[PDB]
Amino acid sequence: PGISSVIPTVLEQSFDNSSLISVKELLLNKDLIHPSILLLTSHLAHYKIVGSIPRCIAMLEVFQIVIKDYQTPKGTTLSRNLTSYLSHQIDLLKKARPLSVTMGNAIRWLKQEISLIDPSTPDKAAKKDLCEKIGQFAKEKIELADQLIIDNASTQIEESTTIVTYGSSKVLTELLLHNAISLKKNIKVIVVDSRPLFEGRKMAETLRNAGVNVMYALITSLDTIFNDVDYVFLGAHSILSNGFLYSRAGTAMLAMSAKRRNIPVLVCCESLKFSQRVQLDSVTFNELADPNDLVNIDYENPVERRGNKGALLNQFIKERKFEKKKLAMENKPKGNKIGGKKGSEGESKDASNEE
Amino acid sequence: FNITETYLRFLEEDTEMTMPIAAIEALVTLLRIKTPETAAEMINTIKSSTEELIKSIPNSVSLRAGCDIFMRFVLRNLHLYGDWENCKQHLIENGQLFVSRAKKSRNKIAEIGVDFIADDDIILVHGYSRAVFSLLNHAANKFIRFRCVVTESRPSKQGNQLYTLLEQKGIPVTLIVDSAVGAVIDKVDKVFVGAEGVAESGGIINLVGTYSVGVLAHNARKPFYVVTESHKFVRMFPLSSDDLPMAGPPLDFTRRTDDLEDALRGPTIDYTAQEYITALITDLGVLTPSAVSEELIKMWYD
């Protein structure tokens, strides 16, 4: 069935809203789970590249593999043990890493498609049309929509401009690549990064591989890099019905500084990214991770030192806690780019009712 | 047949024929000559004439907005796959009916937007829109008590023009300079504004000092008003505080001169964000914040 309970480090006096645990190294599991799920869960447990957008694309492709591998039993019909098997997938995904919003809208789409097709049509004729529809759904709601964000941003950005960014969002990487290569402008791109993971480093590396004028910075060094900047792009994860921006780590800090230092904040988003759940602060529902990633003196990722820190359990109160998914305040961002072109953040739920 | 020339003929007219409504009426006249039966011959030539109009534009925004609504109405006509002739006759007729709707809307607003001005309130008015002044005149017709403060706006000297038009009515006034406009927000109940355009975001497209008014009022917590006729909506999203469509200067710094000729250059049109507007008034009900975007989403269906 799986491994449950027994957690590393202290239970903590402050911040105990979410699960801090799970299976990293494979020990005692059911022998029916499709290996592509087992690969993705082992990926997302220690992932450096993904941030909202690519996670769902991978989740869709894994589902496409499962359906291609799916052969309907002679006794039990298509809608019999499929939905239980999918519930086993999600529960294993939940154990590894809390799901994104876009992942939820994908699952909801798939469960709608199961109910739409009745067990009466031939099995090989069924799955052949299904994967075609998923491919068209991935075309429309991701790839073609992404291209629409690209061109919407293209008109918005002025000629010869400085941009500061954060994260490892797929949409923004392609945005900047479009700016450097296809349009050919003088774009100075500054990238910022935190401590738990080097998302910005990876983005800067890819921009260097393109050949961009890149400065690489940290949160501590912000009040020096600004005093230059014209636009700030944030890697969206979810915008709520409120209009609040639930995104990655060092996001709100940047957003605040920008608002106070005149220059606006811009956020690129997808029509699949919006949710109807609501919150107002970072404490509400957080994506907590184990302090194991924050033990080492960083530099790269694996260095293995006999340093100063080591003990978490035996130490008399030493909560070295960090968060991953935080909240930006509502008024601070100004632009949102989506499937329906444009719209300010105070108009958040004009997509949810439009469906 | 020309469309820019037809718009140029309105010199001593104006006031009744509002600047966009006269351009929309000019669009309908150009449509009705060369047969609206064909959708390939006509729409493409309408698009070319709007492009020629934009190229001739020096510092106007509302003419581009008014074209969009026209286009939208034309496309919506034969959305019922109706007779290619009764749908056409309804399209040609909705030109004079469009101008007649500017009168009906003004009749609506001037009875709705007099409620905001309460018993004995000192007003600091900025800019000049036909909707805001019509509120001011038809409140005097309603026999209501209000004081007025004139802002010294500097485009083609608008403050002096506003002051003279207030004298013709019978309401006590005095000149206040836009530099000293901060020193007035204590003896002023409410601040009013007339806009050149209203943003997709919920912000405002206005004159040579309006953002400055918006911020000071936000500091003093005193209300900030925008009153207009409901046709000045563009699918425009000015991302930053100083970014707008221009044919002239976006802040130019000149070389050393002795004769003194190159000086004036400053941002003549300025944007203000959504937060600074307390209230917005049009004929499309009483609505301010996310309302503008919902209107634009409803129109564009995107």
Added chain:
Amino acid sequence: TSHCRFYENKYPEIDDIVMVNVQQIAEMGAYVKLLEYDNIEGMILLSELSRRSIQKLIRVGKNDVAVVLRVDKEKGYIDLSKRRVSSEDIIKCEEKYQKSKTVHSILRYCAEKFQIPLEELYKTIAWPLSRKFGHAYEAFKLSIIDETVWEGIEPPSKDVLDELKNYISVKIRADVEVSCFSYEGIDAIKDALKSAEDVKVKLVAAPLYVLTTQALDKQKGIEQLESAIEKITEVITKYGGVCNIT
């Protein structure tokens, strides 16, 4: 060069059905190009292309189904409609499009080989095939079974005509492992060669014989190869040896 219309005249009419490959989107509708009636632009409006949110529909991707409303036979202005085409007619629109696409593929080898303009070749073909016979696809199907449509109009290029017939019409490899332990075997292999060749049979090694059997409709090569295996087995059983065939 890819040009010239599929039909006889340049501009369409009223009620005639076409297939469009989408080029642009939004505002008006889509200034595009056709795959049924010329490569010039023919515009439609958002209303027509909706019926039944929409951004996900097509937006310059594949092909749809549209009917021509308004044609300007003076300078070049075309109007279309997507909604108007009935569900029974949609299948017929797709089949005419498939017929037009096959005609366009046929009249492209001619321009490549002899280095002559495609519009002149399209004009000389579309007079007995497209106007008199009915359509160019069914006339081509008549010509491959028994040449009767091609015999009417005289062709200036006959080498192109032979290259096109070869394209409408592939070798399948076969190896024979000869391991004879008989008194006479040379005369036997010569007899097996005279029955299989009279397609191309060559010698590489003493035990291995490499032969490529030609197929007209791809499946024809299997029946002739199986006949060749039967003929080799009949030859060597009498002399006193063994022939292994793969």
